[PDB]
Every structure is written in C-alpha cells, then in structure tokens.
Design a protein around this ligand. Structure first.
Ligand SMILES: [Zn+2]
Ligand SMILES: [Zn+2]
Lengths: 133, 133
C-alpha cells in the first residue's frame, strides 16, 4: 500500500556488547509491545506494527572509538506511551534495574512543561525517550 | 491512544553540515511525503504520520571524529516505498543529483533476491534504504 509509503521500515544500530544491549531492549521493547522477529549470533531484530528495530554486534576492529551521542549520527530514539502512568511505571522500573535516568532534576518535564517523558540510557549510552500523549 | 504505544515518536540525528544534510533530506523526505515541522538555526524536523525525524547541527567540539556507520550507534534508516517503480524512480533521481548509490553490483537486490531496494548515502555517510513491498 502507498499508504505505508514514507513510513520508517526499519532502523539498524550497531551495539558494543550484544548481550547487555539485548537485555535492555528485550525489556523495554517488551514493555512497549514489540515481539521478537529474528535472533542470531551477531544480532537481533524486533517487530512492532510495520516497523522493525535491528541490533547488531559492532565488529572488533570498529569498537573504538566508542559511541558518543553528541557526535554526528544517532543522538536518541523516542517512543510513544499510552499515558503518563506508563511513563511513571517505566521510570520506576528503570530505577530498579539500575538503567541510567537522565535529567532527574527536571523529570518528567525535562523536555518542557508540556512534554511528559522519561529520558534514559541504553547500555551503549544511546539516549532513549518514552513520551506520554 | 494505547494503540500508538510502542510506535517510534521521533528519531534525532546530529549532522556534520546542516545545510548539506537539509538539502538531501528535504529532497528524500519530500519524495516520501513528509512535511516540514520545525526549522531553526541549528536544525530541522520533518513529519510523517505519527513519527518525526529531527536533524541537528553537530557542535564544533564534537565534529571529530567523524561518523562511521560501522561503529557503535546508527548504521542505517530504511523507508517504505509504494512500489518497485518508486524505488526505480528514486534510484534514477539519486544518480542525477549525484548522491552515492551502494552495492550497484547487486542493485536492486543487494539485500537479497526477495528484497527490492535502493541503498544510498546521505551527506554524513549515513546509509539510507528505500524498500519496495
Ligand atoms: Zn526527543
Ligand atoms: Zn536494511
């Protein structure tokens, strides 16, 4: 369908330590309703609607220099939540599992007074956001 | 709506030379049906459906080292096309405007015999894919 045209089909990201990354994403994408698509020795993909998220193991010869979200390339990914309650729930989960929570001083309005969201970090230091409608 | 839950809300990417990048994305996102959302001195965002794409100027002190899609972080973004014809059309456009076309030796099946797509590079060397249904 031409209706799908322009929608994002998939997004592929190289990760430093696959195992650790898969632990985080399985959890988050799990909490957000994604299902596993394909898993292999060097990666894993997840499905939601008509868009996939694919994570691959960074090759040895390319693990250095390490990823920095301030540099050219990816800064962050943001996802929709059904409600503020969901954002609150995720925030609490994050704290428990120890995933880094950003801008705690302004949470859940670090993005502005009319922007209700949690900002965190995946194991690669990639910034991740979940925003309430 | 809880129906939106888990969908990607937006994706933010730092770019090396904003002007050049905006030239490419305006064109591509233009060809894919996106509309401009917000433009400022250091960036620009585009809208399609319920998801936005945001491009920001990489800070001076962070332009080095340059982006490499093989390293940890973003490798590529892929988008849906309505048809093979659209993919062919985009390929021809790419060649004309001189944007780099990848895996020309296998095009439009560089991704496999049952994967019809064009792979190219944005001005940052970020890999970009448009895939036929
Ligand atoms: Zn954001
Ligand atoms: Zn792809």
């Amino acid at each position: 369908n031409l209706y799908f045209q322009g929608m994002l089909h998939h997004v592929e990201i190289n990760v430093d330590h696959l195992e650790e990354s898969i632990a985080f994403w399985d959890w988050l994408l799990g909490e957000l309703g994604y299902e596993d698509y394909q898993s292999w020795s060097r990666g894993k993909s997840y499905k939601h609607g008509k868009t996939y998220l694919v994570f691959v193991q960074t090759e040895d010869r390319f693990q250095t220099p390490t990823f920095h979200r301030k540099r050219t390339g990816l800064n962050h990914l943001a996802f929709h939540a059904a409600s503020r309650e969901k954002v609150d729930e995720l925030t609490q989960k994050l704290k428990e599992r120890g995933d880094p929570i950003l801008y705690e001083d302004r949470h859940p309005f670090a993005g502005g007074p009319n922007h209700y969201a949690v900002f965190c970090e995946d194991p690669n230091r990639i910034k991740v956001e979940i925003v309430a409608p």
